[PDB]
Design a protein around this ligand. Structure first.
Ligand code: 2FA
Ligand code: 2FA
Ligand code: 2FA
Ligand code: 2FA
Ligand code: 2FA
Ligand code: 2FA
Lengths: 237, 237, 237, 237, 237, 237
């Protein structure tokens, strides 16, 4: 156990799915995992372990922001033997052709955080996902009949930015979605030698501001999780 | 309601105590406030409003990290009429003459985050607390007979730092405690026009590695809470 | 005609292979392309256009360094309708398990240049390749019975850097090879909306010099070109 | 004697008031101290030691700019046993509700200088004053019936700034006065182990351009001097 | 032999003239040198050594960009005993009074590259030429009845920069010409203890395109070479 | 008049010599100028105007540090019509072959200040002197039988550096002397379109710490001033 996770080696599977919202972790465990059990409750960051189609899988929230998810991912890798981390979240879109409910896979993640510069002697470290994990997720999506865009995400430190100037810049350079953790998780994976991937569903757009129908948004969220879980099986082969 | 808080104007007091842990907020509400009622549960970030010695007061968690707390403090200030924010957290000590459970008051907060440079044209913004609030806290501590040091805190983005040599630099410059939110809350208070103060309880020592348990951090740090609450009453007069 | 390319729209195929050594352009045209014709000679940067199994392909050198390749890739994209750029070069390795003559594919590229910060308002831009192109190269190599590693490349501005301490850092973060252009080409692709990929063969293993015969190098180089060319055909399917 | 001060241990009191102007130091010595004697003249940087209400006190100029005052404050602390430094200078106002001759107390000091980043591994060091000294100054002002605001100052390297837009940023973040030494004195106090405080008299307004004459700045800023001297006595008790 | 120069100590004179366009090396050898012999052909970078009025001189191209020229200049200095490097190139002008075909001499060179900061611990290194070489070039030009301007050059990493606002800044600070190598060569000279100078002829006037005949350019180029060569003889006296 | 100079247009010559010490300005006026008169006394920064061999010349101190001299040089150029500024100071040596009493001429000046980055959009501005002024000073020195080294100076913000690490770096890159103003004055000259030059005499060495005989040091200082004054006459021709 650590100050943030009251569990022991063995309590987590070697693969952990991670949503930002701890309440979303309980939702995922209840909906897709069989014979699941709660393995952490410290600070209310619920974690669960169960099986998917016979495969042992864990799911736990990571909180909002690079600093928060950096703590949890590091501990899972160095204290609980986790090999793969799959972040499952939401993002905002800036590109005109990326629409609501689009499933985005971040092969890379830009950021305005200073954490990777501190790690990489003030130079440019390209925060990327594990290639095989990206491939497995793209393949799982095809199998489910889902289209998925693979590209760059942007991990922001400030949800409420003082200068809405970076949005035009992100759009200019092709960023697919704006979130707050990918670059941090990729930095941790590289520093401690594990593999990671971030998958997101477009929750809102920079330009047009119009939702759809709850039922439809919730269907897309479940598709993302199915893509995540099915990508793991593909990787096991 | 705001993107991360499901409440309406009036649900929160004009002053809010904020620990990083939602579970500590719950404990504070049950132990120190009368007629306490839960006003928020989104993402599990519990918020409560009650009364202390007849004074209306709220207490809500803010999560770990500058990005997380920047979201909550901003929303409270712009949509719920919150005028004062008093962070009541934990921190790690670097100085040899500082021990577990000591209370520290951050008149200033250093940081390795980029958020303030983004707000201040890449220059050095001195993230400081509100003077009157600091004085109120000092007076309240003396009245309660509790010791408390006033000085600089260091708000880190990485709990697990890639270079421990920086701890030597922090020590040399007299940093009283290492935490992860102060500089962010102060930057937000200045940007959106409110007042803030951070009070911390030393929960661990970075050099000796002596630690307090998560349970202890969640329900046993009473001194700082007493100082915080009594300091508000002093401010009202 | 552009400042550095004396040709007209239509002279280049929509896909261009680019080696660092200009002398390699003529070799590739004569050895792998059919009905090749010369399309550029400015500053000695010889360019050729022909076909590979019916597919129109072009080849032209880019010169050493990010500044040089940035000029050529930009002009090809904005003035000659080029949609895909495939850099075929060499690199030095820092990892023990990465051996001489190995073929590496840069899904991403780190760097110590300031070009991307100039583009990305001094923030961290993850210079990445086009995912489909990466997957095409991997599948083409497999079909040719060649094993290739997919990961991060490091694009250095100084072949002779003042301090080798950075090589230790590169090794710690999993960099597969050290070269001098990838991060620059990826930046151009993002800025002008095109696709790019860098494939490299390990020609030296910094801090560990082994031996190879001119015939072995000939073989490995030809392997890299066949992988690149077959990858394009896969992308067309 | 030190490189810039021709005196011996004992010549200076353990507390020294320091204006940027040597001529103001002379005026302070002749107007407020009894039995005042000149102890330094090197480079024209006049220093004096006398008594105030029986209390031994010194007053010496420090010159304009962080580099200049860093030299003098360091030498006093390391070779003359000086424990407290109280800067009594002038500043320019940026806020509309601030007028000429208003007194300001810098609890913190922002800056565009690189000196603190050089000391703090390129991170954000919050240059703050000694809390007790700030409180002493506030109490002394109230006792004298003089108004005084407590807040952030901005220490500039360029009196004639290349970009006036930064003044808008300073105003937005509530900077009370623009001067050129505070952040430097605070950095020195922390590095060499002493305590410091900066008190300023608004001598001009950056927006309205209203100005005070050089003669006025040299011999008419009495309020801040009274607060400074009386604050020391308070500290002794 | 070095990685990029297949030759031995003694093959190059202690003074080397370097154009950016490799094709210019053979032209200079045939047109101005006596008894010239080929000494390099690696990667197509042709090098020649001969004599000018009895003085041993060498000529070889350096390629476009700081990274490229940094490789060649370094190897020449550390492995072939070269003591002086004279870059003979072209540049674009931003100042009104600087006209097409003008000859400019870079006593100093500004830059947006990070190479010198990497060398100078992230501080400002003034990349300058050797004073005597500058004075020799000025006197040689005068003797040839040619007027030359001596000032700052700007070495750009991106020929196609994302924002032309910097050209206004360059104009304001007196930059005479924009090119892509000077600052890099000067850095190498300082790092390995050698002497360097960059002479350029204005080939374009950014934001103001005029006209010139191929014969006029031929003349101006020959003028620059004669100035460079005669400058060496002056330096020997 | 300005807040720093109580004089009027005409009071200063179009050429001003500037030592750091205001007392040195009186020494220079008294020793080399005829019919001189004091033209400024504000803050004790004495300025004088007289003639040298019939030529009208001024001399005034600039204080220690870039921020201080930046104020005075700017005002002289924009408010008093000064065309040339010649700083005459002292410096510390780092190179083994640069000995005490050597006369150094800074054709360029490195720095750890941020002032030129603020001016030059965060890029590298090469702070250089006016070529003709450097040439005139070298010529005047020859005429007086004095040897003078021309090269780079380093302008430090901290006389008492926290990291004596930069000294080896300066030596590594050939810096001739360490002082505190050159880079700032060159920045002002460029920003407001005037000409400047810095000449220094070696007052101390980094390695060997041994003086000579006052009479000898004072002879060298006067030689520097004679070089300065005689360089002006040469320029008038
Ligand atoms: N438009 C958006 N902008 C930012 F900055 N973050 C977004 C957005 N949409 C969703 N997120 C994700 O949800 C959380 C913040 O509400 C964070 O966890 C974040 O990853
Ligand atoms: N040693 C420590 N280092 C850092 F960076 N933060 C610390 C430490 N001890 C306690 N904290 C505070 O508690 C949370 C992390 O457990 C964060 O919310 C943080 O503010
Ligand atoms: N070890 C190496 N280090 C660096 F910096 N670049 C390398 C290395 N091996 C090959 N290259 C590639 O060949 C050229 C430089 O010789 C450049 O074009 C570059 O991409
Ligand atoms: N508007 C102003 N801007 C700046 F930068 N400094 C100011 C201003 N007014 C007064 N000062 C203070 O007085 C001196 C400069 O006259 C410096 O010593 C400085 O601290
Ligand atoms: N206007 C110009 N802008 C830039 F950036 N470089 C210029 C220009 N004119 C000529 N050059 C010189 O020629 C090459 C680039 O075409 C490089 O070798 C460079 O030194
Ligand atoms: N060794 C030295 N180091 C530094 F930083 N400055 C030096 C040195 N010797 C002389 N100076 C010059 O004299 C003043 C500082 O005493 C400043 O005005 C400065 O220019």
């Amino acid at each position: 156990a650590t100050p943030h996770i009251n569990a022991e080696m063995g309590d987590f599977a070697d693969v952990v799915l991670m949503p930002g919202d701890p309440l979303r972790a309980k939702y995922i465990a209840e909906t897709f995992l069989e014979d699941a059990r709660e393995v952490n409750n410290v600070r209310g960051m619920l974690g669960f372990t169960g099986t998917y189609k016979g495969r042992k899988i864990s799911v736990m929230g990571h909180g909002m922001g690079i600093p928060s998810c950096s703590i949890y991912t590091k501990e899972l890798i160095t204290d609980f033997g986790v090999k793969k981390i799959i972040r499952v979240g939401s993002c905002g879109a800036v590109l005109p052709h990326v629409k609501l409910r689009d499933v985005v896979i971040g092969m890379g993640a830009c950021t305005d955080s200073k954490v990777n510069r501190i790690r990489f002697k003030d130079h440019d470290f390209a925060a990327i996902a594990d290639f095989d994990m990206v491939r497995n997720a793209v393949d799982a999506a095809k199998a489910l009949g889902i289209d998925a865009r693979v590209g760059n995400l942007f991990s922001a430190d400030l949800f409420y930015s003082p200068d809405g100037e970076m949005f035009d810049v992100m759009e200019k350079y092709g960023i697919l979605g704006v979130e707050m953790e990918a670059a941090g998780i990729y930095g941790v994976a590289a520093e401690f030698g594990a593999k990671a991937l971030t998958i997101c569903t477009v929750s809102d757009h920079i330009r047009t501001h119009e939702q759809t129908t709850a039922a439809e948004r919730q269907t897309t969220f479940n598709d993302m999780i199915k893509i995540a879980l099915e990508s793991v099986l593909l990787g096991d082969k």
